[PDB]
Design a protein around this motif. Structure first.
Motif, PDB file in Angstrom:
ATOM      1  N   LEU A  85      -8.555  31.388 -48.258  1.00 38.98           N
ATOM      2  CA  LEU A  85      -9.503  32.412 -47.850  1.00 38.98           C
ATOM      3  C   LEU A  85      -8.720  33.577 -47.242  1.00 38.98           C
ATOM      4  O   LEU A  85      -9.247  34.342 -46.426  1.00 38.98           O
ATOM      5  CB  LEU A  85     -10.476  31.813 -46.825  1.00 38.98           C
ATOM      6  N   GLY A  86      -7.456  33.706 -47.657  1.00 40.07           N
ATOM      7  CA  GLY A  86      -6.527  34.640 -47.040  1.00 40.07           C
ATOM      8  C   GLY A  86      -6.838  36.098 -47.281  1.00 40.07           C
ATOM      9  O   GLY A  86      -6.350  36.975 -46.558  1.00 40.07           O
ATOM     10  N   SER A  87      -7.644  36.381 -48.297  1.00 36.18           N
ATOM     11  CA  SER A  87      -7.995  37.773 -48.582  1.00 36.18           C
ATOM     12  C   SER A  87      -9.261  38.214 -47.826  1.00 36.18           C
ATOM     13  O   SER A  87      -9.762  39.319 -48.041  1.00 36.18           O
ATOM     14  CB  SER A  87      -8.197  37.985 -50.081  1.00 36.18           C
ATOM     15  N   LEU A  88      -9.794  37.354 -46.962  1.00 36.98           N
ATOM     16  CA  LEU A  88     -11.001  37.718 -46.212  1.00 36.98           C
ATOM     17  C   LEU A  88     -10.621  38.546 -45.002  1.00 36.98           C
ATOM     18  O   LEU A  88      -9.722  38.159 -44.231  1.00 36.98           O
ATOM     19  CB  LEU A  88     -11.761  36.479 -45.746  1.00 36.98           C
ATOM     20  N   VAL A  89     -11.299  39.678 -44.822  1.00 34.11           N
ATOM     21  CA  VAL A  89     -11.014  40.556 -43.684  1.00 34.11           C
ATOM     22  C   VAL A  89     -11.384  39.896 -42.359  1.00 34.11           C
ATOM     23  O   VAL A  89     -10.603  39.918 -41.411  1.00 34.11           O
ATOM     24  CB  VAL A  89     -11.753  41.902 -43.786  1.00 34.11           C
ATOM     25  N   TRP A 146       0.199  39.135 -46.145  1.00 28.07           N
ATOM     26  CA  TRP A 146       0.746  39.871 -47.267  1.00 28.07           C
ATOM     27  C   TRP A 146      -0.179  41.005 -47.728  1.00 28.07           C
ATOM     28  O   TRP A 146       0.264  42.149 -47.913  1.00 28.07           O
ATOM     29  CB  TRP A 146       0.999  38.886 -48.402  1.00 28.07           C
ATOM     30  N   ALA A 147      -1.465  40.699 -47.879  1.00 30.82           N
ATOM     31  CA  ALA A 147      -2.430  41.695 -48.385  1.00 30.82           C
ATOM     32  C   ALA A 147      -2.517  42.947 -47.512  1.00 30.82           C
ATOM     33  O   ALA A 147      -2.866  44.036 -47.993  1.00 30.82           O
ATOM     34  CB  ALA A 147      -3.807  41.055 -48.543  1.00 30.82           C
ATOM     35  N   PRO A 176      -1.235  50.184 -49.853  1.00 30.68           N
ATOM     36  CA  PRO A 176      -2.345  50.388 -50.799  1.00 30.68           C
ATOM     37  C   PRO A 176      -2.023  51.282 -52.005  1.00 30.68           C
ATOM     38  O   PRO A 176      -2.868  51.396 -52.892  1.00 30.68           O
ATOM     39  CB  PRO A 176      -3.408  51.090 -49.930  1.00 30.68           C
ATOM     40  N   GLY A 235       2.582  49.451 -54.296  1.00 30.44           N
ATOM     41  CA  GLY A 235       2.893  48.111 -53.822  1.00 30.44           C
ATOM     42  C   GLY A 235       4.237  47.553 -54.239  1.00 30.44           C
ATOM     43  O   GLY A 235       5.077  47.277 -53.377  1.00 30.44           O
ATOM     44  N   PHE A 258       6.468  43.648 -51.182  1.00 28.32           N
ATOM     45  CA  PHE A 258       5.707  43.068 -52.292  1.00 28.32           C
ATOM     46  C   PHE A 258       6.376  41.794 -52.824  1.00 28.32           C
ATOM     47  O   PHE A 258       5.692  40.841 -53.215  1.00 28.32           O
ATOM     48  CB  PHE A 258       5.589  44.104 -53.415  1.00 28.32           C
ATOM     49  N   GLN A 266       8.366  39.774 -51.208  1.00 31.29           N
ATOM     50  CA  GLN A 266       8.622  38.822 -50.129  1.00 31.29           C
ATOM     51  C   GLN A 266       7.421  37.911 -49.887  1.00 31.29           C
ATOM     52  O   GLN A 266       6.355  38.373 -49.460  1.00 31.29           O
ATOM     53  CB  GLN A 266       8.929  39.564 -48.816  1.00 31.29           C
ATOM     54  N   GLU A 267       7.590  36.620 -50.143  1.00 29.10           N
ATOM     55  CA  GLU A 267       6.605  35.635 -49.700  1.00 29.10           C
ATOM     56  C   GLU A 267       6.470  35.659 -48.183  1.00 29.10           C
ATOM     57  O   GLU A 267       7.426  35.951 -47.467  1.00 29.10           O
ATOM     58  CB  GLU A 267       6.974  34.238 -50.195  1.00 29.10           C
ATOM     59  N   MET A 268       5.266  35.377 -47.696  1.00 26.67           N
ATOM     60  CA  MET A 268       4.973  35.459 -46.275  1.00 26.67           C
ATOM     61  C   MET A 268       4.073  34.308 -45.855  1.00 26.67           C
ATOM     62  O   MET A 268       3.204  33.871 -46.631  1.00 26.67           O
ATOM     63  CB  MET A 268       4.284  36.786 -45.965  1.00 26.67           C
ATOM     64  N   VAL A 269       4.287  33.811 -44.637  1.00 27.12           N
ATOM     65  CA  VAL A 269       3.427  32.771 -44.081  1.00 27.12           C
ATOM     66  C   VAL A 269       2.501  33.414 -43.052  1.00 27.12           C
ATOM     67  O   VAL A 269       2.948  34.194 -42.191  1.00 27.12           O
ATOM     68  CB  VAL A 269       4.236  31.630 -43.425  1.00 27.12           C
ATOM     69  N   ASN A 270       1.210  33.105 -43.141  1.00 24.80           N
ATOM     70  CA  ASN A 270       0.253  33.672 -42.193  1.00 24.80           C
ATOM     71  C   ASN A 270      -0.326  32.616 -41.241  1.00 24.80           C
ATOM     72  O   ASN A 270      -0.799  31.561 -41.681  1.00 24.80           O
ATOM     73  CB  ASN A 270      -0.871  34.392 -42.944  1.00 24.80           C
TER      74      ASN A 270
END
Ligand code: HEM
Ligand code: HEM
Ligand SMILES: NCc1cccc(OCc2ccc3ccc(N)nc3c2)c1
Ligand SMILES: NCc1cccc(OCc2ccc3ccc(N)nc3c2)c1
Ligand SMILES: C[C@H](O)[C@H](O)[C@H]1CNc2nc(N)[nH]c(=O)c2N1
Ligand SMILES: C[C@H](O)[C@H](O)[C@H]1CNc2nc(N)[nH]c(=O)c2N1
Ligand SMILES: [Zn+2]
Lengths: 405, 404
Positions: free
Chosen positions: A36-40, A370-371, A376, A379, A385, A387-391
């Motif tokens: 659900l990582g793209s949820l604001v 990441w998002a 915008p 990218g 862009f 680079q993998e990232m952990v949230n």
């Protein structure tokens, strides 16, 4: 090999493991079943004490006094306070550490290379809306510094049990009015329609421009909000022009220098600061791509493209991309000309990569969304862009909080 | 329970109920989100349940659930698993299965097209030579003189204790990457490894930037074999620019057909380790990623100098300017050559339509936001502002280890 998320950069082929996520004491919105990582915005003294203890441990680590006598005494000092009052108070240097750590921990912020350089104004003695206004004006003055912008945060009194919150109703200290027209459209910034109507309901005499600076609605505890107009000389604005397209200046576009977010909650050690506005400087894409070109914001893309004489009847002319570039270029050029601090999305992301490397060394990882970090426009042209990232959520933290109405 | 999904441009909200149909774990946990990672970190009753689930999906699709044919087919599958440890799909089931896998692929922006897929059954293939014939027909069909048609060719499934059918190339058509010992790479740096494997398996290498690689095809437990694709099969498009006359001088070109050949297709517990599929390119794949990525052809600075831009500083946005003109050159050139292509605005608009269709049909749609949002002009497209839910449904395409 190691039992931690493996993180890869696809441009460089380099690998790290994030060990810091092990320090997360709060669950985000994702599960093994769905991301659900793209949820604001996705959906007890014992609890306070554990959070408080954890923060005090963080503080004494940062000053290399972990396990010391002063560390254990501060622990007992806090537990005693909570035992007798149900809450506790931060020492000043704890507040400074805490506010910096909250920025450092903010997954959505690309400007964190700067995190150790933050001016922290203690306003925890403030007791009125008039007084909040004074602190805020001083913040704006210090932070604007006539165009040589300086990061800053002003912290107002914490949430108190059996007392109302200090709240700043505006989402930023500087915002443009959005006036709903009798044809359905909006003059000004459609993002700010609701707050504009609240200001009017509260006695503001509305203008009718596209770029009218809103007054502040400031709420001291257990009182209705009071309306304050910022003196225009304190609000630095930049008229937008383009280095080669002479007509662009004629569009009459402008933006303000200081991005001063004012509706976020700062949480430190279980304590909650409902009013703690902070500011830095802009990244150009925030103004040029999002604020000016979002279809639900000023939406000027088509207008600029017509001036550039692009074929706006077909997607394949890339008119949107061509106009967006020139708008972003206008933003950068105009800020540089006016000598107001601004950072382009290439410099910002390159500096964020340096920050990831710093934090890998200092803490064994860096929470990042990441998002939000990837800009915008353009990218994949920026290094983030690839680079993998952990949230994940670390505390101290800035958090969204519901609107006070 | 069910995720509330919001579009921030239009203010509209949906709820994804389809995600409850997921039986396979992704990489995220409540402690940390790993959604930006490209690749995953790493009996008969299990197979039988995946098989029953798939057969149920199939008979539901033809509005025949509960029918006697449905019941008899479940028994056939059960009888075959119980005796042999596995089973085989009928051609119609295979066709349905490949289309569902595409429909379910969360990283694919092209899924409005999902119901239109030509499926070649190549499961009666017994040798590398026969794979090559099937592959050539696939390419001929799909290319169709520039009027591209989506297709998939399906080679025999994996079997217990027997090596897999594999195509070693990542795509049926790829440009060689030659590692000159002075550090640099000539050609496509993404393909250094495969280029070297081809050479050592007896390929005579070229020395250009766009040398089409031969196919390394492997039948079970055999050394792979080398096959050169007949050049008349491989449609290419020379790149030129509608207003920049010098652009064509760069000698840039790209192939028409994006044909991924190293992904595993999983249908109802069966795995197809060789099942290459192709559609058509979205222009940003070629313009932005393949040509402008720093670890690919990396042409940005070259183009920016030809446009006489200020390469000294980031704040002149030279990179953004050159990237737009490259993407325009690709679109122009493909349109001029009458070869199918879609720009990132048209593609993302159609994807929004797809989300709406799928919301009504299935109550949701798995989507990987980081992959769906294009690599330039992200927020200028409607998908940027659309929240998405990512999860794994079966049938599915999966990554699989390199066979070497
Ligand atoms: C010094 C220059 C700074 C730059 C260039 C910068 C840049 C950015 C950008 C581009 C974003 C994304 C915002 C959006 O898309 O609306 C962001 C988010 C954020 N920034 Fe930074 N920032 C800076 C300073 C700060 C400071 C001083 C703080 C706090 C003390 C901060 C805290 C945050 C937080 C909490 C977010 C997430 C906001 C949200 O989720 O809505 N930033 N920043
Ligand atoms: C018909 C026109 C099509 C278009 C425009 C399209 C578009 C795209 C794009 C732009 C991507 C991102 C690729 C990348 O960045 O490397 C993608 C990924 C993907 N596509 Fe589609 N596609 C099409 C057809 C198909 C077909 C026919 C299939 C399968 C039958 C398919 C399955 C997939 C899968 C599985 C991925 C994820 C690949 C990965 O994870 O590496 N697509 N698609
Ligand atoms: N998307 C909702 C919304 C509404 C109003 C402001 C806002 O700003 C987020 C934000 C927060 C802190 C920032 C710090 C610096 C900066 N340049 N932009 C920043 C942007 C976000
Ligand atoms: N990202 C690794 C990697 C390596 C080799 C090929 C590849 O392609 C992904 C892919 C998969 C299916 C596609 C379908 C259509 C299309 N235009 N591009 C598509 C691209 C991806
Ligand atoms: C749906 C999606 O999460 C939303 O549009 C996000 C995407 N990325 C973003 N990134 C930044 N920096 N700021 C934003 O407001 C957003 N919005
Ligand atoms: C690290 C990051 O996830 C990676 O670069 C992703 C980002 N989004 C992408 N999107 C598409 N379509 N294709 C890609 O290869 C990638 N790469
Ligand atoms: Zn996630």
């Amino acid at each position: 090999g190691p039992k931690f998320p493996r993180v890869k950069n696809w441009e460089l082929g380099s690998i790290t493991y994030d060990t810091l996520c092990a320090q997360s004491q709060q669950d985000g919105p994702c599960t093994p079943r769905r991301c659900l990582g793209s949820l604001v915005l996705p959906r007890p003294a014992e609890q306070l004490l554990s959070q408080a203890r954890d923060f005090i441990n963080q503080y004494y680590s940062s000053i290399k006094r972990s396990g010391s006598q002063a560390h254990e005494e501060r622990l007992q000092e806090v537990e005693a306070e909570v035992a007798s009052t149900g809450t506790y108070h931060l020492r000043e240097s704890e507040l400074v550490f805490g506010a910096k750590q909250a920025w450092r921990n903010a997954p959505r912020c690309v400007g964190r290379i700067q995190w150790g350089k933050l001016q922290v104004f203690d306003a925890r003695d403030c007791s009125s809306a008039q007084e909040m206004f004074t602190y805020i004006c001083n913040h704006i003055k210090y932070a604007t510094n006539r165009g040589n912008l300086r990061s800053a945060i002003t912290v107002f009194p914490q949430r108190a049990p059996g007392r109302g919150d200090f709240r700043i109703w505006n989402s930023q200290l500087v915002r443009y009015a959005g006036y709903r027209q009798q044809d359905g459209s909006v003059r000004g910034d459609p993002a700010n329609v609701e707050i504009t109507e609240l200001c009017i309901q509260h006695g503001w005499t509305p203008g009718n421009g596209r770029f009218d600076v809103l007054p502040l609605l400031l709420q001291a505890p257990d009182e209705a909000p009071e309306l304050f107009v910022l003196p225009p000389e304190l609000v630095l604005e930049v008229p937008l022009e383009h280095p080669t397209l002479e007509w662009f200046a004629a569009l009459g576009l402008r933006w303000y220098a200081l991005p001063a977010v004012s509706n976020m909650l700062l949480e430190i050690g279980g304590l909650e600061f409902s009013a703690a506005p902070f500011s830095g400087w802009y990244m150009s894409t925030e103004i040029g791509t999002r604020n000016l070109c979002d279809p639900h914001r000023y939406n000027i893309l088509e207008d600029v493209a017509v001036c550039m004489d692009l074929d706006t009847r077909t997607t394949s002319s890339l008119w949107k991309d061509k106009a967006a570039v020139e708008i972003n270029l206008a933003v950068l050029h105009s800020f540089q000309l006016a000598k107001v601090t601004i950072v382009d999305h290439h410099a910002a992301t390159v500096s964020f990569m340096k920050h990831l490397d710093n934090e890998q060394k200092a803490r064994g990882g860096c929470p990042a969304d990441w998002a939000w970090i990837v800009p915008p426009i353009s990218g994949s042209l920026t290094p983030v862009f690839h680079q993998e990232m952990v949230n994940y959520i670390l505390s101290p933290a800035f958090r969204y909080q519901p609107d006070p109405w």
